[PDB]
Amino acid sequence: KVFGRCELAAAMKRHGLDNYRGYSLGNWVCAAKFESNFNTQATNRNTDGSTDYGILQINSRWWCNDGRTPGSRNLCNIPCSALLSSDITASVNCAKKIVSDGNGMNAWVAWRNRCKGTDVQAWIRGCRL
């Protein structure tokens, strides 16, 4: 599914991400935007062999099992394919583990480089929430 911007904000808020670990909803929408362009089926291979999955581009080195990343963990305890569902529940639950792990939203290099410190509320402006 490719979400629209306010549809995704609403989905994110419904699943408890708005102010999760202190991160206001516009930060989660901005991170989505640049990690996957709001498409639940996004995938990208990293140089190391791992792969990043879904709207928040969650990586198989630590978080999900995709059967082909040697040495990796699956600390979300889910198949990476779960992360590509039109229903974002598995992406969100795994993102709340990731942002709790120590470095907050810096675990998402696109949110540090493209969202951190910017007027992230522009990503939810206008939306009914």
Residues annotated as part of the active site:
35, 52
- Does residue number 93 form part of the binding site for Br ion (CB under 5 A)? no
Kindly indicate which of the ranges 9-17, 65-73, 87-95, 111-119 contains the residues binding Na ion, using the contact rule CB under 5 A. 65-73
Annotated binding-site residue? 101: yes
106's CB contacts (< 8 A; 6+ apart) are 112, 116
Segment 66-105, which members bind Na ion (CB under 5 A)? 69, 72, 74
Helices of type H across the chain:
5-14, 25-36, 89-98, 109-114
Tell me how many degrees the CA angle 75-123-60 measures, rounded to the nearest 5: 20
- Does residue number 65 form part of the binding site for Br ion (CB under 5 A)? yes
- Given the complex with Na ion, which of 25 and 95 has the nearer CB atom? 95
- Does residue number 59 form part of the binding site for Na ion (CB under 5 A)? no
Residues 112 and 105: beta-carbon distance below 8 Å: yes
- Please tell me whether residue 93 adopts helix, strand or coil conformation: helix
- Given the complex with Na ion, which of 4 and 49 has the nearer CB atom? 49
Binding site for Br ion (CB under 5 A): 5, 11, 24, 26, 65, 69, 79, 87-88, 104, 121
